[PDB]
Amino acid sequence: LPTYQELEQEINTLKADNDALKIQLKYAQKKIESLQLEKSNHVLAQMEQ
Amino acid sequence: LPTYQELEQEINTLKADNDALKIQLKYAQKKIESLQLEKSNH
């Protein structure tokens, strides 16, 4: 069986994977919005009211 | 302190969350590519 310490290390790895996927997902969603806005000659940063 | 069982539980939850994020990211990447293809045609 894996050691309790190994399980701890695995959790640390999986949390890091989680953090990376979340930031990449936000980045990808912003890119989708940017491409949609490009169709109308606008950029994401100009849309803040 | 977390019991060894509760660590196993947390590992399964994290794997599930990570698998769900990978699916959402893949769909986001497909939409980006689709939009780039549309742009190049337009």
Numbering used by the authors:
A (entry chain A): 745 to 793
B (entry chain B): 745 to 786
Please share excerpts from the published article on this structure.
Residues 747–789 within the C-terminal region are predicted by the COILS webserver to contain a coiled coil and are spanned by the RasGRP1CC construct. We determined the crystal structure of RasGRP1CC at 1.6 Å resolution. Two molecules in the asymmetric unit of the crystal form a parallel, dimeric coiled coil of nearly 10 helical turns that is structurally similar to canonical coiled coil proteins such as GCN4. Leucine and isoleucine residues stabilize the dimer, and a pair of glutamine residues in the core maintains the proper sequence register between the two helices. Two pairs of ionic interactions (Glu 754-Lys 759′ and Glu 782-Lys 783′, where the primes refer to the second subunit in the dimer) further stabilize the dimer. The structure of the C-terminal coiled coil demonstrates that a second dimerization interface is present in RasGRP1. Consistent with this structure, RasGRP1CC is exclusively dimeric in solution from 30 μM to 1.5 mM monomer, based on multiangle light scattering measurements (data not shown). The fact that the C-terminal coiled coil is parallel and dimeric is consistent with an ability to readily connect with the autoinhibited catalytic module and reinforce formation of the C1-mediated dimer. Because coiled coil formation is independent of the C1-mediated interface, RasGRP1 is likely to remain dimeric upon disruption of the C1-mediated dimer by membrane binding. Dimerization in this way is expected to enhance the affinity of RasGRP1 for the membrane by allowing the dimer to engage two Ras molecules simultaneously.
